[PDB]
Design a protein around this nucleic acid. Structure first.
Ligand code: CL
Ligand code: CL
Ligand code: CL
Ligand code: CL
Ligand code: MN
Ligand code: MN
Ligand code: MN
Ligand code: MN
Ligand code: MN
Ligand code: MN
Ligand code: MN
Ligand code: MN
Ligand code: MN
Lengths: 108, 85, 96, 99, 94, 104, 97, 78
DNA sequence: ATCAATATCCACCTGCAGATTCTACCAAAAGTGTATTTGGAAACTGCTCCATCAAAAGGCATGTTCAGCTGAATTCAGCTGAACATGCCTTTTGATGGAGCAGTTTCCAAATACACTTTTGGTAGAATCTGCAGGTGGATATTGAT
DNA sequence: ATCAATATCCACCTGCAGATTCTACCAAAAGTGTATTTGGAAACTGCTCCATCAAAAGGCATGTTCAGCTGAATTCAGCTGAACATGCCTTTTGATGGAGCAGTTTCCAAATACACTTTTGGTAGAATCTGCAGGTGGATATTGAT
């Protein structure tokens, strides 16, 4: 039979489409899952993570580090109006906070 | 725990509370803030540990796992990243 | 007699190499990423599940995923995700 | 002199220092006992994965830091620089934790 | 007719049990309807997740109970847990 | 001969059971789950109607209206917390004025 | 010429509206604003009667609750008059900002 | 249109909120706030409308929109 | 604190309009009786971890002394915001129509589910690779007293 | 308008705990070949929704007045920060033991799968009644004069 071609390579993605499809089928979200659904979702997840690794990589570079750590992710997320909105009720373990001293507290 | 565990909320020392307020950007701290913070922390932990334990008993386990805690934190609208393994 | 646990780790690493060829990632950082992928997954699938339900449909399709994406994500982040999502589908259906 | 810093300068040095780091501010063992004690009162003989306690400590500290942030805004709103119980109360009330 | 169903008859029956002399306006009833659907989804939803976390495919009274324990505050939980197990027993008895 | 009457309930065991399987909650639904669930709903409903029934009585109304439900709900601490993020159309609010706002 | 002291009528108004449950914003003005806002998202849309009422019940409830928090912030600052500063602090803490 | 929400109307809402004295800057601040409120909700309501392939925004669409925004409303079908 | 003179609430009452409750009939659902599967519970059993405790070292919590400067109290009046009488018009509300469209049905081509079988991509240790944590020092601000 | 005094950086280095790779199965995608389910593509319908059109009755926009709240300007008793000396007890690593997750099997109580029969619950006019609109008459307050 035809040589095997993964659905990820067909959609041109890095995230596992087959995996996601299984996760959708077994998560009791609906009686049936369309063929395009896992592709769409797997792509959105890949996009969102690529989008946060971009910002975290930069923060890591601004700190002269070649390895991304929880703190870089916090900086990235909390310094981006939208990501922060999206993860407003989420906490990054070992992320710390953004430096911010209320002006009125500075020596007068 | 072998020895009975008692009055440990006092383990949350004045200085540890001070460091927390610093990180939160506080410059000056009233003397009564310490007990208040202990009281708030206790309520926070009880609420979460309660839900966590409920997941544990429901799984018929005797061991509270990070997952139990993660699921409890999420229920309180307190989602945590980093311990789902 | 093994206990193998799946994760998004290899995929997250491949994406990291794309956007930053010179960067690595601490396992704890990888832990945050895995938590993040699962959170969004559930938030999206969840909204999609309801959508199909409110509309009396038994099947979640790429259309349900799309509106869920427009509902959960803020402004620009959404248009972008829609782009990637639509692009991936059209490319996939054409057996491309 | 003896050299002595003015009240507030070191407090500011500390703020900058901790907003720059990410380490847990509460000590481990003491926090661990508290968790086992509270849990002990719900179900006896419970065990805990090392990770479970760490997750709890990360969550509590992130929660308190955030509460102090809001609490600080309340104190400042009242033209004060010193946080007081009334500030934590107003914040927990508005947050809907004790409305 | 198809159209749509609600909990109206049942809410009216419980009302008669607690206040035989009392009735309910159309809107107040609309409010009870919402209330019921809301609580239902919260518990079924929590029961679903509970069952999934433990890799169980079926949702039983055990999952509904834990869900109620997680969702209801203090006393409300105690009384709901009693009424529930109470109803199961009777249902199982006769 | 319905399941509701077999559990000593007013609330619909059968319909609750159906809503459970159609709701994408799990592949299977046990026999007692709907019974238990229907019971909790009947209990919560009775709880609220009881108090709302009172409120309507003290207002000299024979019919409960949203005002009464909002009163019942907000004056009870546990129900208030259960519905802390819910809003009752046409319910208004609990009359209440901050002490510092009163004269004398 | 009879003239109530400042505050006495505001108080009487507080008792009045906290006792009632009717909508406090005029129907048409509101409805018109809803349609306008809606236009900036999707076009040539139609609205169900009940849909506009649902949005209005939510708005009023939302503004009423916000004003309660705002009031606590004003009273916290030794004032009895709400100011933009109060609404801002309240929304900051609610996580709306 | 936003001006349609008059001063006496905002006063009334604040009264039910227990407010006794009001700064003149409040009315415009309240209109701004209200606007963002309606936008966030109407955005999602309409999105539910569009997914169902309808041109008419239903009460439910609104109800689902309020629910997502954590502003659950009772009495309009849900 | 009293009197007096208004001004607003707040039951209570009557006449009905219009919500509710009450009736009577189905389609749609729930209930039944049988018949067959099967999820998952009980019974082991491998072996990860978790509970606890021991020791040494030293990072930190504590208690104490002082006095800087912040919160709390007060006073005073500039001028913001409330209370009111006026005059205007925008919002009510009341029909009348036309029609833009949710809602439904009947089909069927196109899309999904599923059991069986191949074929890897993923994951769990080993085996390698290496950032950057900890340590060290002068160079640079940043304070606070003069 | 300085300068000891300290704290804060920045750059450099190294090796070991923490990433990254390299291996090798093998659980779980993907490829086939049917066996169901669907989503609509047309074609029709009564509707709830817009559209106008038109009185008018509150409600709102304005312009006056001036009560009294918000802030600014002071004052100063003490609380809370800054430094230190102590010496307790948290951290680090590891050792022991065995409690209890997790992985497998075996197999019923329990859940699903039909084929039909009964019983409901939703509907919509009819037949009740119950709030509501207006009007008092009598509490309850307010506000100004003394
Ligand atoms: Cl699809
Ligand atoms: Cl205080
Ligand atoms: Cl069951
Ligand atoms: Cl302001
Ligand atoms: Mn790049
Ligand atoms: Mn089986
Ligand atoms: Mn001051
Ligand atoms: Mn004056
Ligand atoms: Mn391979
Ligand atoms: Mn370093
Ligand atoms: Mn059969
Ligand atoms: Mn009937
Ligand atoms: Mn009246």
């Amino acid at each position: 039979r035809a040589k095997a071609k993964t659905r990820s390579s067909r959609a041109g993605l890095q995230f596992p489409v087959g995996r996601v499809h299984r996760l959708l089928r077994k998560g009791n979200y609906s009686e049936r899952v369309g063929a395009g659904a896992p592709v769409y979702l797997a792509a959105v997840l890949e996009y969102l993570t690529a989008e946060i690794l971009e910002l975290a990589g930069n923060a890591a570079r601004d700190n002269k580090k070649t390895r991304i750590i929880p703190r870089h992710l916090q900086l990235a997320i909390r310094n981006d109006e939208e990501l922060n909105k999206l993860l407003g009720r989420v906490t990054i373990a070992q992320g710390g906070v953004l430096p911010n001293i209320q002006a009125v507290l500075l020596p007068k | 725990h072998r020895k009975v565990l008692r009055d440990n909320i006092q383990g949350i020392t004045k200085p540890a509370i001070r460091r927390l307020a610093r990180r939160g950007g506080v410059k000056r701290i009233s003397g009564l803030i310490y007990e208040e913070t202990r009281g708030v922390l206790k309520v926070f932990l009880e609420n979460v540990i309660r839900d966590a334990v409920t997941y544990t008993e429901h799984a018929k386990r005797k061991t509270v796992t990070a997952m139990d805690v993660v699921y409890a934190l999420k229920r309180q609208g307190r989602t945590l990243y980093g311990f789902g393994g | 007699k093994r206990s193998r646990k799946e994760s998004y780790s290899v995929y997250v690493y491949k994406v990291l190499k794309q956007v930053h060829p010179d960067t690595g990632i601490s396992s704890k950082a990888m832990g945050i990423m895995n938590s993040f992928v699962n959170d969004i997954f559930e938030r999206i699938a969840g909204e999609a599940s309801r959508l199909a339900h409110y509309n009396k449909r038994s099947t979640i399709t790429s259309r349900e995923i799309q509106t869920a994406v427009r509902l959960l994500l803020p402004g620009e982040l959404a248009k972008h995700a829609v782009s990637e999502g639509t692009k991936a589908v059209t490319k996939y259906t054409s057996a491309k | 002199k003896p050299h002595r810093y003015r009240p507030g300068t070191v407090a500011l040095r500390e703020i900058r220092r901790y907003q720059k780091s990410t380490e847990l501010l509460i000590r481990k063992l003491p926090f661990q006992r508290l968790v086992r004690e509270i849990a002990q009162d719900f179900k006896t003989d419970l065990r805990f994965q090392s990770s479970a306690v760490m997750a709890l400590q990360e969550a509590c500290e992130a929660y308190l830091v955030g509460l102090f942030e809001d609490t600080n805004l309340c104190a400042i709103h009242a033209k004060r620089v010193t946080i007081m119980p009334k500030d934590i109360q107003l914040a927990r009330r508005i947050r809907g934790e004790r409305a």
